């Protein structure tokens, strides 16, 4: 599953992604940690908030 970024988000830890509107995050996994996803952007995997993105269906 891929997601599209709907709202900008700035990483506040090194394991998070910084994401910008329009970007596509690839191969997204829903985490145990509620509200968070893990996925690949610019060839790097990291965590990002689920309410800043929309699942591409």
């Amino acid at each position: 599953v891929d997601y599209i970024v709907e709202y900008d988000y700035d990483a506040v830890h090194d394991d998070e992604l910084t994401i910008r509107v329009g970007e596509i995050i690839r191969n997204v996994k829903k985490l145990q940690e509620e509200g968070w996803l893990e996925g690949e952007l610019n060839g790097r995997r990291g965590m990002f908030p689920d309410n800043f993105v929309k699942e591409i269906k």
Partner: peptide, 8 residues
């Protein structure tokens, strides 16, 4: 550290 559920 814990992470919040960030708000737009």
């Amino acid at each position: 550290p814990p992470k919040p559920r960030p708000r737009r």
